[PDB]
Design a protein around this ligand. Structure first.
Ligand SMILES: [Zn+2]
Ligand SMILES: [Zn+2]
Lengths: 154, 154
């Protein structure tokens, strides 16, 4: 069973990064860390999308991974998509040194995110609190700057 | 339980392709089809490798996916790696039309190839019948020309 995964995020602009995942036990959290560069300073939505399909770049990854058909939320919310990892923050150099721990995604089982797509977005995810229709779907995080398929790692 | 998967192959050179996987029954075969271009005319090894890790390009994909610790063979041989999908054939325009049906790989359970890497190789795989060590490991198929993580598809 997988205890590590990795994702190489690429896109058509300056955004690119490598993100690691580790889950030492299948009943425990997944640690998510890595570095993405090229980002405008501040918050960027950071989500696992349903499909690991990059045939049309980031668009073919589909919507946020949402096997329980919930509304969009922030990672601390009970009402959230499985793929709702919230925001990552880039510094004044444009670098996001990601450090997230999440207990809803998994590397095995029904919430398994291996073979799905991680996407870093153009804007802040409002964590489902924006009061418009879009907030309940995407958090108003805007376009997909860079993405990659989440793969099993050694 | 995935029934469809896709893989976008890319590498440092011109080899590019999209390969689709479909498995309508969990205990049934997998259909594998699509097209790779930019290849030299002739046969190229076509394998699922163990890690869906592209951090160092196709090198970080590691060895052929081999959960049952067998020897390398062709896809019709009973002694084979789970990831041994034989050769694809490129025509004079450098295009390989891939169409195979395989009963050893799966899109679910312990042989599951989602999150691993499909790699197209520089030379013909000798199907484990070239009589040196290298043949029983890699089939002497040589360099990795392009690869991608195998992702869940709609
Ligand atoms: Zn969401
Ligand atoms: Zn092999």
């Amino acid at each position: 069973m997988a205890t590590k995964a990795v994702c190489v995020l690429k896109g058509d602009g300056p955004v690119q990064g490598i993100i690691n995942f580790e889950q030492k036990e299948s009943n425990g959290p997944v640690k998510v860390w890595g570095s993405i560069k090229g980002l405008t300073e501040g918050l960027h939505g950071f989500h696992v999308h349903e499909f690991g399909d990059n045939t049309a770049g980031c668009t073919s990854a589909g919507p946020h991974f949402n096997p329980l058909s919930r509304k969009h939320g922030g990672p601390k919310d009970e009402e959230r998509h499985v793929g709702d990892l919230g925001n990552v923050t880039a510094d004044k150099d444009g670098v996001a040194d990601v450090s997230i721990e999440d207990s809803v995604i998994s590397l095995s089982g029904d919430h398994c995110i291996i073979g799905r797509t991680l996407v870093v977005h153009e804007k802040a995810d409002d964590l489902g609190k924006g009061g418009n229709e879009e907030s309940t779907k995407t958090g108003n995080a805007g376009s997909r700057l860079a993405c990659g398929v989440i793969g099993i790692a050694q």
